[PDB]
Structure 1
Amino acid sequence: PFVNKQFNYKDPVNGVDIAYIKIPNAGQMQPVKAFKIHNKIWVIPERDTFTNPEEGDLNPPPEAKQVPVSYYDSTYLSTDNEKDNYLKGVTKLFERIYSTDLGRMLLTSIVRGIPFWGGSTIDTELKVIDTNCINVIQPDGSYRSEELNLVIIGPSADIIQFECKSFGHEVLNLTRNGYGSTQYIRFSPDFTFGFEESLEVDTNPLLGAGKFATDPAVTLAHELIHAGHRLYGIAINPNRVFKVNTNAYYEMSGLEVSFEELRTFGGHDAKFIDSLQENEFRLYYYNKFKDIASTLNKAKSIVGTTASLQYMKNVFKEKYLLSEDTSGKFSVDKLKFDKLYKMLTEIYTEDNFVKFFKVLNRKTYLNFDKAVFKINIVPKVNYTIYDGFNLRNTNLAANFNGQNTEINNMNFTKLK
């Protein structure tokens, strides 16, 4: 959210909000320099070669998709200057998001969404799940475990393949059982995508449609929304999809988009979501919250240090907006639940963020006219927290001229 201290990649480590860390993942990975920009939120300016064991090298593989779809460059984000620029770019986007009432709400929900402590094998004991923490190096070289909710990290091999991912559990489906897990968003503020808009009467007699660029703040908010769903364990299995086209072809060759993506994008395409399906999940997760409240009630022991069982139950009381009677028992308030659930799944949408940002954005989830551009959001003359690319008091202020790749050409370098 609001990042109080200004960070420079070269700033000296302090073992608190600037330090070398190791991700639970696996392998004795060499620690990487990370920055805590806000409570429960860290930024790691490194290409993500840690989250998935089968995704460790950055070279384009044989058969890689071409330019518009994917983009490779094994050397991107390998120098201190790039990492510094990445850090400042990500920070500026957080401020732009936080500057809207919706973003402030989303960021708050994210900070409160602490991943549940359902690790221990003893149903009567609360224990933090290791993969919901990072290891922070101390002055003597030992490591201290720290819980976090969100990490913004550099992309893997495909530089423009942004996604919100997390570490799985052997048996628990953390993002779909109400528990939640620490989210790692592969993201880059140094590139953006194009789309074609019908800003000319919506009905154009076959003429060169304008070539616009997506505002990175919208792209990041999109992932933070998935992160929110995932932090509260209410994400929808990617296998659940809906058709958006019309008819389909052999081997399920029909235009289908996952439930998760349609609700996240919102707007027009949300109508393709079956209402019965929506209700089924709303109720399913209702019961998940209940089971959590029950586990909190039937809990006695807890593992850790600076955290007491009482202190934690209260932390989860706040996250899941639970009701606490005089006796101390927890229960799920159906009215509170419906409020929180709607917020996370209906209010937090890309469509709504586009309305608060007053920017131009593609109207439909699937983009059939893709383009990729190298950008630089750090210089104030290029992009600001309040106007994005459409700087007020410049010829870029009107008609989304700032996002127009031909009008504001100096800010968008076509990658092909």
Structure 2
Amino acid sequence: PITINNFRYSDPVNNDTIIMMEPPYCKGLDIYYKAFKITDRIWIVPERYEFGTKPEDFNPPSSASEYYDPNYLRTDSDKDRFLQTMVKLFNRIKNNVAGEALLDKIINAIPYLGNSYSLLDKFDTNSNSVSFNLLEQDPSGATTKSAMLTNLIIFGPGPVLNKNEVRGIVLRVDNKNYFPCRDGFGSIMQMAFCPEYVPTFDNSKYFQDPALLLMHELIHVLHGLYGMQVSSHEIPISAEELFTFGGQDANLISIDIKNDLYEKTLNDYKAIANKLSQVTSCNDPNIDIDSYKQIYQQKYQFDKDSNGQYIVNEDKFQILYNSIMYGFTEIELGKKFNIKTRLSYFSMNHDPVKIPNLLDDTIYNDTEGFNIESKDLKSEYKGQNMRVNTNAFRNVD
């Protein structure tokens, strides 16, 4: 099954589960941060998401739903707290059969080694869109620089402590933004996440389970890895959000768009089948190109031509498409998790609330979260109720 490594923020680097990585956007800049492999293909970096920000952004400019605090995640203590909370959360997601399924799908959706603008016959790992640099420590004593591939890298929140988000690596090709996670190739996905500040709802009020907030963002991660991240298809919200929530809100996206998206992804995949059909080599010699042809064939659910050409099989594609866009949603995951969800995606999300002690097994555990049955809090989701589980949360301001 899936293993969720353990580690204290003080643990030394080991070139395996604990390293010093230069995040994808800091490529060539030689700026490293300690990171942790929570599990295969997924890393955690206890640092605020600063990319594309300026310190002026990192505090409440004068001019609740937009809470700030520039000191959050700045000391080693905060970081080890952040690190531990994330581990419990992943373990919480892994211990439910439906959570294990999601992580499994995300771990295997490795980004294709290339994109719409890379040599068609060659697998390419030389791109921050697919690989990040790290600092290794030779057995000799020397400290060298190398690189590895990954699917997901999770950070702490950006300026807005309560605004979780998932962005794919943007490549600047021919003076314009290109998204390998919308072309079907997939790319490293990055997450800005804050486990502590959860939203509340009423459509008696409830506060949300942070673990569900994580799976929600993970679903965006899933769409990305398969390269089908619905762009800023605003309509006035992006279809990407609706698909992720689920239930009837998903049907707010017109057949016309859904069909246009489906047809577009299909084209993207036919193109990738063709491309994969010419890869004969790879810049990086430490790569079994034949092993990847196999992995990628399972990823996109392709078949081999009488002559060997990889081809898209409509039926298999449709099953995979439904799986990627419908198989995992906040409504169904909330359902399969004994977790309360807000009525509709458009349901108000009142002032966030802070959960100070998710590390306290008496408040939140990795098998029932807040709804601990032994505290008769499983029933009616009372563990999430604000009038009942009064001690598990504190107000913002």
What TM-score, normalized by structure 2, do the two folds share? 0.91
Partner secondary structure for residue 130 of structure 1: coil
Which consecutive residues of structure 2, in runs of 5 or more, have no partner in the other structure? none
Following superposition of structure 1 onto structure 2, how do residues 249-398 of structure 1 map, counting pairs within 5 Å?
Answer: 256-325=236-305, 327-375=307-355, 376-398=357-379
Which consecutive residues of structure 1, in runs of 5 or more, have no partner in the other structure? 198-209, 243-255
Q: Tell me the residue number matched to 1:213.
A: 207
**CA distance in 1: counterparts of 2:54 and 2:307, whole angstroms:** 50
**CA distance in 1: counterparts of 2:7 and 2:133, whole angstroms:** 21
Contact map agreement 1:195 1:371 (CA 8 A) in 2: no
Q: Which amino acid aligns with 2:31?
A: Q
**CA distance in 2: counterparts of 1:397 and 1:73, whole angstroms:** 33
Aligned residue among 71, 74, 94 for 1:98: 94
Contact map agreement 1:24 1:134 (CA 8 A) in 2: yes
Superposed displacement of residue 29, structure 1: 5.4
**CA distance in 2: counterparts of 1:266 and 1:369, whole angstroms:** 17
**CA distance in 1: counterparts of 2:102 and 2:54, whole angstroms:** 30
Q: Tell me the residue number matched to 2:24.
A: 24
Residue 160 (structure 2) pairs with residue 158 (structure 1): yes
Q: Tell me the residue number matched to 1:126.
A: 123
**CA distance in 2: counterparts of 1:231 and 1:5, whole angstroms:** 22
Contact map agreement 2:69 2:159 (CA 8 A) in 1: yes
Superposed displacement of residue 95, structure 1: 1.9
Superposed displacement of residue 365, structure 1: 1.2
**CA distance in 1: counterparts of 2:211 and 2:4, whole angstroms:** 19
Superposed displacement of residue 356, structure 1: 0.5
Partner secondary structure for residue 176 of structure 1: coil
Q: Tell me the residue number matched to 2:226.
A: 232
Residue 75 (structure 2) pairs with residue 39 (structure 1): no
Partner secondary structure for residue 305 of structure 1: coil
Superposed displacement of residue 17, structure 1: 0.7
Deviation sequence 1:262-306 (CA, Å, 0-9, x none): 111011212211122212211211111111110111233321022
Q: Percent identity?
A: 31
Aligned residue among 194, 205, 208 for 2:200: 194
**CA distance in 1: counterparts of 2:224 and 2:55, whole angstroms:** 24
Contact map agreement 1:58 1:72 (CA 8 A) in 2: no
Q: Residues 405 and 150 from structure 1, CA distance in 2 versus in 1: closer, same or farther, beyond 3 angstroms?
A: same
Moved more, 15-24 or 146-155: 15-24
Contact map agreement 2:154 2:193 (CA 8 A) in 1: yes
Contact map agreement 2:113 2:130 (CA 8 A) in 1: no
Deviation sequence 1:228-271 (CA, Å, 0-9, x none): 11111111111x233xxxxxxxxxxxxx2211111110112122
Partner secondary structure for residue 202 of structure 2: strand
Deviation sequence 1:366-391 (CA, Å, 0-9, x none): 24351211112111111112211011
Partner secondary structure for residue 241 of structure 1: coil
Deviation sequence 1:343-372 (CA, Å, 0-9, x none): 110121101001101121111112435121
Q: Tell me the residue number matched to 1:87.
A: 83
Q: Tell me the residue number matched to 1:185.
A: 191
Contact map agreement 2:364 2:370 (CA 8 A) in 1: yes
Alignment RMSD, CA only? 1.9
Contact map agreement 2:168 2:179 (CA 8 A) in 1: no
Q: Tell me the residue number matched to 2:382.
A: 401
Q: Residues 57 and 141 from structure 1, CA distance in 2 versus in 1: closer, same or farther, beyond 3 angstroms?
A: farther
Aligned residues, how many? 385
What TM-score, normalized by structure 1, do the two folds share? 0.87
Q: Which amino acid aligns with 2:193?
A: F
Following TM superposition, where does structure 1 have runs of at least 4 consecutive aligned residues deviating by more than 4 angstroms? 55-58
Q: Tell me the residue number matched to 1:10.
A: 10
Superposed displacement of residue 328, structure 1: 3.5
